[PDB]
Tab-separated table of C-alpha atoms in Angstrom:
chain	number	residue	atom	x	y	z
A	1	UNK	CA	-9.134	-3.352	-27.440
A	2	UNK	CA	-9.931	-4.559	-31.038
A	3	UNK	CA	-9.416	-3.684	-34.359
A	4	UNK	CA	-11.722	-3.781	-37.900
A	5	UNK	CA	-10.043	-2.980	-41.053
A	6	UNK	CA	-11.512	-4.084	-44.679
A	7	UNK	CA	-9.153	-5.703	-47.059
A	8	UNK	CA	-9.482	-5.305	-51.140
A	9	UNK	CA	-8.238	-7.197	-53.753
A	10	UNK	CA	-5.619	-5.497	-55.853
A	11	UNK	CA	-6.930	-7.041	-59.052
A	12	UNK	CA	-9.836	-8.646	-60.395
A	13	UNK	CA	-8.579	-12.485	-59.897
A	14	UNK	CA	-8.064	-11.681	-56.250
A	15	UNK	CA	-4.054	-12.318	-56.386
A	16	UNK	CA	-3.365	-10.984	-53.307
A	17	UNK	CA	-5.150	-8.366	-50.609
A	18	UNK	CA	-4.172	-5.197	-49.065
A	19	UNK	CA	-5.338	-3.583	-45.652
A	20	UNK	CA	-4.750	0.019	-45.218
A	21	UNK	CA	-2.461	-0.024	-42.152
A	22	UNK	CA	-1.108	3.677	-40.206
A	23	UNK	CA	2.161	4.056	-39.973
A	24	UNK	CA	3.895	6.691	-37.856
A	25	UNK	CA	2.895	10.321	-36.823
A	26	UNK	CA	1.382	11.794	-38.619
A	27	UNK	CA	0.281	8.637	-40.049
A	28	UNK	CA	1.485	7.567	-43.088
A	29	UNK	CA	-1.355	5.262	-44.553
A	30	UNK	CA	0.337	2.375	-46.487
A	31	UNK	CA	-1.271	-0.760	-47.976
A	32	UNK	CA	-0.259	-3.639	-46.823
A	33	UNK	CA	-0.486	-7.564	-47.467
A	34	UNK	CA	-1.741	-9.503	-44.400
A	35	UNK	CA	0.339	-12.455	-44.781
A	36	UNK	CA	-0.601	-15.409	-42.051
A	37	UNK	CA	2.466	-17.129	-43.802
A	38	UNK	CA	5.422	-14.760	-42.364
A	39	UNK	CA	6.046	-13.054	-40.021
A	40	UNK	CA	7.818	-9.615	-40.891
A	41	UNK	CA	6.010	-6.215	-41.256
A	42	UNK	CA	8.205	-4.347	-43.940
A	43	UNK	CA	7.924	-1.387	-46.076
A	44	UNK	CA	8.512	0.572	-49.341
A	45	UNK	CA	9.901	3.707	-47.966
A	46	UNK	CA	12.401	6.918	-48.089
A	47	UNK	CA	15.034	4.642	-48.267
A	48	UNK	CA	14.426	2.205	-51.116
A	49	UNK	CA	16.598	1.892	-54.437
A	50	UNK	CA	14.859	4.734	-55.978
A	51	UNK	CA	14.936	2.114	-59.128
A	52	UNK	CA	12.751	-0.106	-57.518
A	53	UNK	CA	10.040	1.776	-56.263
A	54	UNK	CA	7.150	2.212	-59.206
A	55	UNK	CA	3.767	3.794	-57.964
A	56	UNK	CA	4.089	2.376	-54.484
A	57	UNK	CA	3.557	4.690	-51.372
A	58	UNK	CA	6.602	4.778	-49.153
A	59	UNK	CA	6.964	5.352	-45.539
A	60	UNK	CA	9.212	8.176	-44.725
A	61	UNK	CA	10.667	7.719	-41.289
A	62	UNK	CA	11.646	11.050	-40.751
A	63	UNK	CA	8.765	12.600	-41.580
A	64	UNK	CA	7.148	10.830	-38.319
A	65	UNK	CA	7.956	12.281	-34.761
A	66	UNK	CA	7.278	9.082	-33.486
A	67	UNK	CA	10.219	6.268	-35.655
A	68	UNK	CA	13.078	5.781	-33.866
A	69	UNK	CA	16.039	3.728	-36.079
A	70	UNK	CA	16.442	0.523	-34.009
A	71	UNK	CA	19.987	0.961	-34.528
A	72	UNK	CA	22.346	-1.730	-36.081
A	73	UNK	CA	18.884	-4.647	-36.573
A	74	UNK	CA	18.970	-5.512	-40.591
A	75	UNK	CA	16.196	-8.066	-42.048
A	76	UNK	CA	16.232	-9.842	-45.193
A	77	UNK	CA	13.597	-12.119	-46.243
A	78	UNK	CA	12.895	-14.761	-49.233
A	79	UNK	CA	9.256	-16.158	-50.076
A	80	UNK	CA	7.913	-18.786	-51.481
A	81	UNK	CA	7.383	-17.147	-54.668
A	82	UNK	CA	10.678	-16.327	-55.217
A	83	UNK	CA	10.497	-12.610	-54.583
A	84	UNK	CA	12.447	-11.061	-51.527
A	85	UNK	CA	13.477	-7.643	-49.965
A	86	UNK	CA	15.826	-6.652	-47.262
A	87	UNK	CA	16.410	-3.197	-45.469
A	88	UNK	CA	16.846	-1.783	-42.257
A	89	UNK	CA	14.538	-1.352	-38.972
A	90	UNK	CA	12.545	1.576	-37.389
A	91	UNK	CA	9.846	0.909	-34.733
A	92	UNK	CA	6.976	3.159	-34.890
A	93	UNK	CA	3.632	3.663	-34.032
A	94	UNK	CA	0.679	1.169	-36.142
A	95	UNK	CA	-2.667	0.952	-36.436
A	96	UNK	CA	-4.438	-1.296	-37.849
A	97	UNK	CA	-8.489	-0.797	-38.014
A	98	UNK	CA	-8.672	1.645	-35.108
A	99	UNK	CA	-5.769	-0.759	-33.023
A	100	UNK	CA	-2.863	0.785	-32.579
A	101	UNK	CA	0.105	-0.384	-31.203
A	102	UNK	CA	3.104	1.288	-30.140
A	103	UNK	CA	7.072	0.304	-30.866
A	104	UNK	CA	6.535	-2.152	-33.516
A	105	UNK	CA	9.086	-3.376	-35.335
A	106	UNK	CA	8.961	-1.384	-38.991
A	107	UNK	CA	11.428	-3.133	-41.722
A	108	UNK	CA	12.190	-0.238	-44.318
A	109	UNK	CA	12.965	-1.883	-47.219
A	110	UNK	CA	16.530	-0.223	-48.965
A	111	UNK	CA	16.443	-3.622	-51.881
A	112	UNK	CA	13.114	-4.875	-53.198
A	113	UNK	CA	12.724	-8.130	-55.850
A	114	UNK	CA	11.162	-7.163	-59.197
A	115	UNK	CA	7.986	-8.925	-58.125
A	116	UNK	CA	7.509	-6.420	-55.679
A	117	UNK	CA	8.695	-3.397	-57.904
A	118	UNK	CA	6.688	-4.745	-60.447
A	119	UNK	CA	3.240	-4.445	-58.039
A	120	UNK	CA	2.400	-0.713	-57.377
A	121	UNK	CA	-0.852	-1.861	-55.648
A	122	UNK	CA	1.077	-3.496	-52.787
A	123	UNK	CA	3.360	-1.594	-50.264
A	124	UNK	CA	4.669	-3.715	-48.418
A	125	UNK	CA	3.665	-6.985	-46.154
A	126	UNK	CA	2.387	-7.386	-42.414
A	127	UNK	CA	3.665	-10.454	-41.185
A	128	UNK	CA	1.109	-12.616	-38.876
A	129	UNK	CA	2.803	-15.948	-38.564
A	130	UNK	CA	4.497	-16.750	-35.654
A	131	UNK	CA	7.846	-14.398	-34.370
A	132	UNK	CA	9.309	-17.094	-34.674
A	133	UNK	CA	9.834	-16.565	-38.337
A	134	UNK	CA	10.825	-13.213	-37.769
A	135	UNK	CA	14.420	-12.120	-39.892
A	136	UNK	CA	15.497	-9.147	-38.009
A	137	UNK	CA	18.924	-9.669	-36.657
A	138	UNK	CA	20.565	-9.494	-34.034
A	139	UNK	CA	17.586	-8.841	-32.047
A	140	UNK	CA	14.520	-10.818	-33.616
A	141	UNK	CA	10.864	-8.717	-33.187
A	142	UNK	CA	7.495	-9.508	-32.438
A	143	UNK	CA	4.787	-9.201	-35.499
A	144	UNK	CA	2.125	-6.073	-34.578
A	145	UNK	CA	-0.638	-9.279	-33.647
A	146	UNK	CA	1.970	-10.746	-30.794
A	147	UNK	CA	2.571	-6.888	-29.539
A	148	UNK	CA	-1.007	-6.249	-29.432
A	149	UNK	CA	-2.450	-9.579	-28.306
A	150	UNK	CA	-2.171	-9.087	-24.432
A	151	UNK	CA	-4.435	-5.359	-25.256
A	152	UNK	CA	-6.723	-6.938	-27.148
A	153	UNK	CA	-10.556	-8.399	-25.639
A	154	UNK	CA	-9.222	-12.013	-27.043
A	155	UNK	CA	-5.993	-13.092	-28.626
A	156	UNK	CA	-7.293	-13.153	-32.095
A	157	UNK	CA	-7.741	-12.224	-34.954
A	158	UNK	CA	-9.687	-13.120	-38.021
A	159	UNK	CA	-9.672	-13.585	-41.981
A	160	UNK	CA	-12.822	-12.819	-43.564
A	161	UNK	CA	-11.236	-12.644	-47.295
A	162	UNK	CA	-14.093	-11.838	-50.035
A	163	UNK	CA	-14.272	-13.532	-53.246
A	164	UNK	CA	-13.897	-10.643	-56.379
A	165	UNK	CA	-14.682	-8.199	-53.277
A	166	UNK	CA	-13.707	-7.104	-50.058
A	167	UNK	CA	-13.587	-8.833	-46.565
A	168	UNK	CA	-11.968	-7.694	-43.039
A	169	UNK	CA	-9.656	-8.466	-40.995
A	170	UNK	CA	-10.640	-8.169	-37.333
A	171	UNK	CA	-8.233	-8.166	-34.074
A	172	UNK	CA	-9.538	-8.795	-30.615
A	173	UNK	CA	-13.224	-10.249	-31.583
A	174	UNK	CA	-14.939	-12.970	-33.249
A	175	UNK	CA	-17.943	-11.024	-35.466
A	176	UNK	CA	-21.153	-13.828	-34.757
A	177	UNK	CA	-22.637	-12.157	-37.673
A	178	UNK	CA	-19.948	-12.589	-40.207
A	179	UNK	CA	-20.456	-16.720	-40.558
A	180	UNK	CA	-23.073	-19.334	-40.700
A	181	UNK	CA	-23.614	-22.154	-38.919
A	182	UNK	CA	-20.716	-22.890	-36.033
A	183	UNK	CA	-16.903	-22.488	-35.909
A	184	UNK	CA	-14.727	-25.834	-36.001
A	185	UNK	CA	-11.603	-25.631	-34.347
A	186	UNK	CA	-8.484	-27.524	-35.544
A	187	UNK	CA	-5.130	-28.199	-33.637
A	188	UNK	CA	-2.448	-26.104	-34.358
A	189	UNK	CA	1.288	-26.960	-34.873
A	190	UNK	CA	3.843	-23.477	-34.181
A	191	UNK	CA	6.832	-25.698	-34.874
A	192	UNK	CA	7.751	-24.290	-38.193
A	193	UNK	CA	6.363	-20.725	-37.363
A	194	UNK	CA	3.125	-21.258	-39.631
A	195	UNK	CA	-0.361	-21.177	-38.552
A	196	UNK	CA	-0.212	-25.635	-39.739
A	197	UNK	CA	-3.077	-27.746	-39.228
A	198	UNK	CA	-4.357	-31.046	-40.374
A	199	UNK	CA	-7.384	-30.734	-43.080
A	200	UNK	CA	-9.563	-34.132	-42.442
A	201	UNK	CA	-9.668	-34.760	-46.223
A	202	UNK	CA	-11.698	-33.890	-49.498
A	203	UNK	CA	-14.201	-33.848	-52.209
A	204	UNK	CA	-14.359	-33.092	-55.875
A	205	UNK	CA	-17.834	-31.529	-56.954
A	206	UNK	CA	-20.429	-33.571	-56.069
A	207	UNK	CA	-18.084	-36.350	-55.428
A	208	UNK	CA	-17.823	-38.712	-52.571
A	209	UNK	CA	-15.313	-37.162	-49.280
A	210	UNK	CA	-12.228	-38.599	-49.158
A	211	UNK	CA	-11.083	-38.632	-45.444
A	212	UNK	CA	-7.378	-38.565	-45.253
A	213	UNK	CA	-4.910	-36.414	-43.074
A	214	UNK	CA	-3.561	-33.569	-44.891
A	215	UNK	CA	-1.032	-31.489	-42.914
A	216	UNK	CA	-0.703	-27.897	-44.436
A	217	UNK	CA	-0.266	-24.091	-43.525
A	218	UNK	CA	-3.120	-21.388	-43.297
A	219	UNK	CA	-1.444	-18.301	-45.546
A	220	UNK	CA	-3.483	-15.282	-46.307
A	221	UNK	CA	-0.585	-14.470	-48.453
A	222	UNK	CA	-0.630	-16.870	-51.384
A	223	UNK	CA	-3.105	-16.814	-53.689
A	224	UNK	CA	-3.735	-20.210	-54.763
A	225	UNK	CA	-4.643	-23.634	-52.912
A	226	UNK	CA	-1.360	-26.115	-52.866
A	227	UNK	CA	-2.025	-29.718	-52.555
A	228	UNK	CA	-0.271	-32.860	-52.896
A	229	UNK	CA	0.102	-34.321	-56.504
A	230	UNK	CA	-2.732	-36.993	-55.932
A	231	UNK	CA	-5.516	-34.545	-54.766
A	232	UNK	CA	-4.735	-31.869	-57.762
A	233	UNK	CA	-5.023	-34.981	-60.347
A	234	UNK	CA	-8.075	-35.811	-58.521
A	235	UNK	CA	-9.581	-32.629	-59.126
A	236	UNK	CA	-8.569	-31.800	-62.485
A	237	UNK	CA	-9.506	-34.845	-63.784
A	238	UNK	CA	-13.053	-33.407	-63.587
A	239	UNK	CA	-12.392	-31.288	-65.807
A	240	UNK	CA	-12.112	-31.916	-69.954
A	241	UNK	CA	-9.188	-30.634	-71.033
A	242	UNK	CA	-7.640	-30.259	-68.031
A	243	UNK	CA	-3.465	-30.813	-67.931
A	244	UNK	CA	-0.848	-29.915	-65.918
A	245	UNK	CA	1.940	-27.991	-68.403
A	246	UNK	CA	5.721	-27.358	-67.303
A	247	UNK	CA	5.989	-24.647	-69.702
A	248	UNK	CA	3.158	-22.319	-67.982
A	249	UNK	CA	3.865	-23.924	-64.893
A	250	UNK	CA	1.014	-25.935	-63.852
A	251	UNK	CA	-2.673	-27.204	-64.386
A	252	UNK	CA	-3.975	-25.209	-66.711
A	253	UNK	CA	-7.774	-25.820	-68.626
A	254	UNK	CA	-10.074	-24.830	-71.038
A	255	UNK	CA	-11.537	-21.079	-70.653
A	256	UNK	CA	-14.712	-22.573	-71.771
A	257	UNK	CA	-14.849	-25.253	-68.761
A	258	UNK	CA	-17.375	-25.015	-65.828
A	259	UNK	CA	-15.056	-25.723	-63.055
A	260	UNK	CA	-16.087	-28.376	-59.925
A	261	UNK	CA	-16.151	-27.276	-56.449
A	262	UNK	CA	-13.688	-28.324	-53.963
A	263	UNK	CA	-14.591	-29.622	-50.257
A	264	UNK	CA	-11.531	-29.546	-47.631
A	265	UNK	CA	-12.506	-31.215	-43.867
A	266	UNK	CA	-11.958	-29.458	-40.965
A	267	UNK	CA	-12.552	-32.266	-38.197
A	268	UNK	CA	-15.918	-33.280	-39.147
A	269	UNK	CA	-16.918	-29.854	-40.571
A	270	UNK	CA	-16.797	-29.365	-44.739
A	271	UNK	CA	-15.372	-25.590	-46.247
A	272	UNK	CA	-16.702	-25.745	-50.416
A	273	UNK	CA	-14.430	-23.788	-52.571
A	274	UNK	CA	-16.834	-22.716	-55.601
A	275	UNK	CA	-15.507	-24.172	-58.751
A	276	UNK	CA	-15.418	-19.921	-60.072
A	277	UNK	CA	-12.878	-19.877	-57.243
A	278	UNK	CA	-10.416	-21.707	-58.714
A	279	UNK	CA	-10.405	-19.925	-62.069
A	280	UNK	CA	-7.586	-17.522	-62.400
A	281	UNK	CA	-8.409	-16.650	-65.838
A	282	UNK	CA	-6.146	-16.459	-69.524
A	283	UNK	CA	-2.727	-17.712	-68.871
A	284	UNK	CA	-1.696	-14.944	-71.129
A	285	UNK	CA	-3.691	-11.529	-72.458
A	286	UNK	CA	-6.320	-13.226	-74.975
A	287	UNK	CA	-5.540	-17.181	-74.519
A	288	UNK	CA	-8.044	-19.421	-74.143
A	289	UNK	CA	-6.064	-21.854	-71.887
A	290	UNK	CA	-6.886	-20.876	-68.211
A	291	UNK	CA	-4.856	-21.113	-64.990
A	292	UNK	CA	-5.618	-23.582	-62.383
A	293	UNK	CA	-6.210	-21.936	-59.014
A	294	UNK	CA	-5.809	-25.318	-57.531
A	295	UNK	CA	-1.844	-26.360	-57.796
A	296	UNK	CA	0.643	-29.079	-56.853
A	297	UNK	CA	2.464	-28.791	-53.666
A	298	UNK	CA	4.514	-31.264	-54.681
A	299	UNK	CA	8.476	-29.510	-54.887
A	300	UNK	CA	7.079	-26.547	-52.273
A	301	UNK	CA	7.481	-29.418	-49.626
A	302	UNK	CA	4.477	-27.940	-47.580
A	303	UNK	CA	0.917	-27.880	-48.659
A	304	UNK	CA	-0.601	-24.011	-48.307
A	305	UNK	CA	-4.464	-22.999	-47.807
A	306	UNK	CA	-4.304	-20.131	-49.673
A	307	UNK	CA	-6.457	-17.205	-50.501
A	308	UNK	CA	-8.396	-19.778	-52.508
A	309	UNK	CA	-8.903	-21.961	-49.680
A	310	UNK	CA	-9.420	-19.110	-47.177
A	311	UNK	CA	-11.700	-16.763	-49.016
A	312	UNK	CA	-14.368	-19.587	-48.777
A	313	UNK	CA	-14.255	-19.555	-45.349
A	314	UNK	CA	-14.436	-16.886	-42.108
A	315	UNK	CA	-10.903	-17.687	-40.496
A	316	UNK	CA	-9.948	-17.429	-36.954
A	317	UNK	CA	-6.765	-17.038	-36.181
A	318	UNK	CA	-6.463	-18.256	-32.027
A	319	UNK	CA	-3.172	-17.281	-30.609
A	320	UNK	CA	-3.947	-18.300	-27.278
A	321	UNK	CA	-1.328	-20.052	-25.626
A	322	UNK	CA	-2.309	-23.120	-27.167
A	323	UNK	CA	-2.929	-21.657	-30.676
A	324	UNK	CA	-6.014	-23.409	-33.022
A	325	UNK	CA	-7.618	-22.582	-36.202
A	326	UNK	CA	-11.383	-22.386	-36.900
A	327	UNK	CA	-12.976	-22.522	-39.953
A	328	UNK	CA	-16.986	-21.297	-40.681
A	329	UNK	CA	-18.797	-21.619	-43.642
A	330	UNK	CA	-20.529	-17.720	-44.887
């Protein structure tokens, strides 16, 4: 089997993406974050702190004939960002693009963080790191890509994110027309959960590559590109104006500037990040300071591709049972 579903950004600086994702039966179409970096699929629903639900759509368990309470599992999760939610567990039918699998693991949220509350466009997350990562307890579940990955025509699936438009996310198939030129594989590491792999090095505009061995994670779900310290100096020193300020809490730069691409190796291969990329726009409504889309890493203690990274590339996502990464140019 496969799957093909498109995924939109929910704003117009491409902060995060959501994939329409069916939920139960009937299905209950929710929109969901594909997030490579974790590894739970949870849920506004029925039984969220009425409080904290503003303009999302909720799942409502027992409106479908098909959720069953897996009785006594909890989850509770923390990201990067800060934000977190915790709840209880259903499994239920989901499909994803026309892929449907059955008894996944739903995590109904009962507490969201503010972050969450705060984004109506986003109802909740699908997890596709490793299970690994998974926080249901006592029984820990498999993400919907490890229950369907034995249906599907390959053990794949792919990130195809667009840049101030939408992309797809395919299970199942590699799409030859989606990319140019070949796919490079990279190794993958699954000891911390994360899709990790070792970017060859990098180059600033029109600059000269700088090969050196920079271990990081591939995460559809963070927006920016986090590097260490010496790279994001490197870059932003390119640009006039350019400083890194604790008070808005990073690199920030001059509106006005024309922002420098940004080359990242994969093996011998070279991904460009357009320098309009990396603009997230006004720090505030009206400033003429701009945020960096480019950031430190340093204090995360792991450097993250982000959507940044990602959306100049066609991703694939190999869990065979030696998992890699490949990275096209498009």
């Amino acid at each position: 089997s496969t799957g093909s579903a498109t995924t939109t950004p929910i704003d117009s600086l491409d902060d995060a993406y959501i994939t329409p994702v069916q939920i139960g039966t009937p299905a209950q179409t929710l929109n969901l974050d594909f997030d490579t970096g974790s590894s739970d699929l949870w849920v506004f629903s029925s039984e969220t702190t009425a409080s904290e639900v503003d303009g999302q759509t909720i799942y409502t368990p027992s409106k479908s004939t098909t959720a069953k309470l897996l009785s006594g599992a909890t989850w509770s999760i923390s990201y990067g960002d800060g934000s977190s939610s915790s709840g209880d567990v259903y499994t239920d039918t989901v499909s994803v693009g026309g892929l449907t699998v059955t008894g996944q693991a739903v995590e109904s949220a009962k507490k969201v963080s503010s972050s969450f509350t705060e984004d109506s466009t986003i109802d909740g997350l699908l997890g596709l790191a490793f299970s690994t990562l998974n926080t249901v307890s006592p029984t820990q579940q498999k993400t919907f890509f490890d229950n369907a990955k034995a249906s599907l025509d390959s053990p794949v699936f792919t990130a195809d994110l667009g840049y101030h438009a939408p992309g797809t996310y395919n299970f199942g198939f590699i799409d030859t027309t989606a990319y140019t030129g070949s796919i490079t594989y990279t190794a993958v590491s699954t000891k911390q959960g994360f899709w990790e792999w070792t970017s060859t090095g990098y180059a600033v505009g029109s600059g000269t590559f700088k090969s050196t061995s920079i271990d990081g994670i591939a995460d559809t779900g963070t927006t920016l590109l986090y590097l260490p310290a010496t790279v994001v100096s490197a870059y932003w020193a390119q640009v006039s104006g350019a400083k890194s300020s604790s008070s808005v809490g990073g690199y920030v730069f001059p509106c006005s500037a024309t922002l420098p691409s940004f080359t990242f190796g994969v093996g011998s291969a070279r991904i460009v990040i357009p320098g309009d990329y990396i603009d997230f726009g006004p720090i505030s409504t009206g400033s003429s300071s701009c945020f960096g889309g480019i950031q430190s890493s340093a204090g995360i203690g792991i450097n993250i591709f982000g959507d940044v990274a990602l959306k100049a590339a066609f991703v694939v996502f190999n869990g065979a049972t030696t998992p890699t990464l490949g990275f096209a140019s498009k």
